[PDB]
Amino acid sequence: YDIQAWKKQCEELLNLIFQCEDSEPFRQPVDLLEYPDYRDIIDTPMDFATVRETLEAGNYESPMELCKDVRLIFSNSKAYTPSKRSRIYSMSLRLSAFFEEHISSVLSDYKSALRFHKR
Ligand SMILES: NC(=O)N1CCN(C(=O)c2ccco2)CC1
Numbered sequence: 321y322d323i324q325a326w327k328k329q330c331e332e333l334l335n336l337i338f339q340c341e342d343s344e345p346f347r348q349p350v351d352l353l354e355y356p357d358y359r360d361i362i363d364t365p366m367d368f369a370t371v372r373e374t375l376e377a378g379n380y381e382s383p384m385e386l387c388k389d390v391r392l393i394f395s396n397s398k399a400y401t402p403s404k405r406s407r408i409y410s411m412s413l414r415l416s417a418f419f420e421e422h423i424s425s426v427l428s429d430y431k432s433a434l435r436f437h438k439r
Contacts (some may be wrong), residue, residue: 321436322429327375329426334372337419343368346380361400366392383426390419392397423424 337343347368350358359365371389379384394402394416 322435323433323437325343325433326426326430327430330375330380330383331372333419333422333426334368334375336422337368337415338372338403340415340418342415342418345408345411346397346415355400358400361373362396364396366396368391368393375377381425387423387427390423391416394419 338347349365349370350362351369352358366389369387369388371393374380374389375386394412397409397412403409
């Protein structure tokens with residue numbers, strides 16, 4: 321029933337994601353010299369350094385907000401990919417599966433703790 325536990329749990333999950341080779345394309349923003357049309361396709365860029373920095377600045381109120389930004393990293397990859405078999409998109413799918421598998425208990429525990437708090 322710890323309402324604040326999600327933050328350290330998210331920090332540790334972000335640490336695991338940064339150790340994963342599949343996250344390399346998603347750690348920093350996309351360079352426009354390499355992908356000139358990126359902002360024509362993607363209106364809201366997002367990356368794992370921005371998520372980690374937002375978390376560490378105390379700018380997420382809940383793990384649901386963090387989850388929305390992480391999911392935006394993956395939807396941006398799906399929207400930008402020219403093919404469903406591309407290397408970078410295929411890395412996003414594995415990383416998304418890993419993230420969803422680990423974030424599930426973080427979300428469940430937070431929502432349960434909040435319900436207990438408001439009982
Ligand atoms: N850091 C980068 O330069 N990226 C390249 C564009 N991105 C993609 O999701 C993507 C899908 C298919 C090909 O690239 C984000 C990562």
